[PDB]
Each structure stands twice: as C-alpha cells, then as structure tokens.
Amino acid sequence: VTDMNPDIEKDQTSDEVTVETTSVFRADFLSELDAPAQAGTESAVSGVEGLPPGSALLVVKRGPNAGSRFLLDQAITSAGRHPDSDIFLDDVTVSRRHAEFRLENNEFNVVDVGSLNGTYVNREPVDSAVLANGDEVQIGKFRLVFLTGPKQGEDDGSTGGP
Structure with missing residues (x-):
C-alpha cells in the first residue's frame, strides 16, 4: 500500500x-434532457435506422459514454456496465445492467432491473x-434512442420511377 x-x-x-457506489452523474433527472426535443433524423445515408434484417438496435445518441448501442441481433443483450454482454456504457455508471433488451413475442424490449444512475424511457420509468422508431431510453446517464425496420408494416416497393 502507498506504492507507485x-x-x-x-x-x-x-x-x-x-468508489463504493458505481458512478452517479448526468442521469435523466436534471440535465441532457431539459426539454421534449425529439430529433427526427436518419443516419445520413440511412440503412442503419430503418433496419429489418433480423436485427434491431437502440443506439445511445449522447450521454457520458455516448456513441453506443444494444445489439438485439441476439435474443437478448445486457445493457449497462458490462465486461461481457454487448451494450456497455462506460461500464462505470450502470449497475451492470439497466436493462436487458429481451426479444419476446418477436419484440425487443428494455427490462428495468435497477440501474445505478436511474432508469427512464421517454421520461417515464417502465418494466x-x-x-420503437425514434424514441429514446435512459440507462444510467446516457440518452439511448432505438430504431428498426418494423414500424407500420413493410409492403415492399421497387417500383418508383417518375
């Protein structure tokens, strides 16, 4: 002790x-959010927001770690502070997982299991x-919005030449 x-x-x-408690800060209570400003924007060239190739993802827009995502390409991913799962957000803020995005009934969902900073999804706590398409979830202290191909059904269309 007293080395280095x-x-x-x-x-x-x-x-x-x-560090007795996993780190607290920024969470969906005081900052980041502020106002109900929903950003209706696609991923530049698109193809990774309206994705129905048997995969869907929540992606953390911004919030301490930022830049991240739950890969629900598998039947269920643990989201939060994770050494080994998929959705790790800095791995210092969350109680290992805020949620695990479990696919049941063909639908991927966020299961709150208690995250350190706090769990919200669209300014409301859920189970x-x-x-969904465009909405965002709070895990710990990051703003994570999910996108996917499924939305209103896919009728398919290659005919579109004016």
Whole structure:
C-alpha cells in the first residue's frame, strides 16, 4: 500500500473509500434532457435506422459514454456496465445492467432491473418497453434512442420511377 514509487510520500489528505457506489452523474433527472426535443433524423445515408434484417438496435445518441448501442441481433443483450454482454456504457455508471433488451413475442424490449444512475424511457420509468422508431431510453446517464425496420408494416416497393 502507498506504492507507485514510495518516494511519492503524498496523499490528498486522508481517507480511502471513493468508489463504493458505481458512478452517479448526468442521469435523466436534471440535465441532457431539459426539454421534449425529439430529433427526427436518419443516419445520413440511412440503412442503419430503418433496419429489418433480423436485427434491431437502440443506439445511445449522447450521454457520458455516448456513441453506443444494444445489439438485439441476439435474443437478448445486457445493457449497462458490462465486461461481457454487448451494450456497455462506460461500464462505470450502470449497475451492470439497466436493462436487458429481451426479444419476446418477436419484440425487443428494455427490462428495468435497477440501474445505478436511474432508469427512464421517454421520461417515464417502465418494466419492459418495446424497441420503437425514434424514441429514446435512459440507462444510467446516457440518452439511448432505438430504431428498426418494423414500424407500420413493410409492403415492399421497387417500383418508383417518375
């Protein structure tokens, strides 16, 4: 103890405990959200928001880790602080998982199991909310919006030449 070259005979002042709780901050209570501003935007060239190739994903728009996603290409992914799952958000903020996006009834959903910062989905706490088009979920302290091909049915159309 007191390693890393004992020549550094310096501490803060005292104390030892700092990370007793998985890290708290930013969560869907005070900041990021602020107003019901829903961003109706597609992924530039598209093809990764309206995706029905047997896969769908929630993607964290922005929020501490940001840039992330639940891959629901498999029947269920653990979402949050994860050494090994799929959706890891910094792996420092969430109680291992806020949710696991379980596919039941052909629908992917977020199952709240208690996340450290707090669980919300569209400003409301739920049990298991369906992967939807454009809506976003709070896991810990990140804003995670989900997209998928399924929406209103897919009638298919290759005929579109004016």
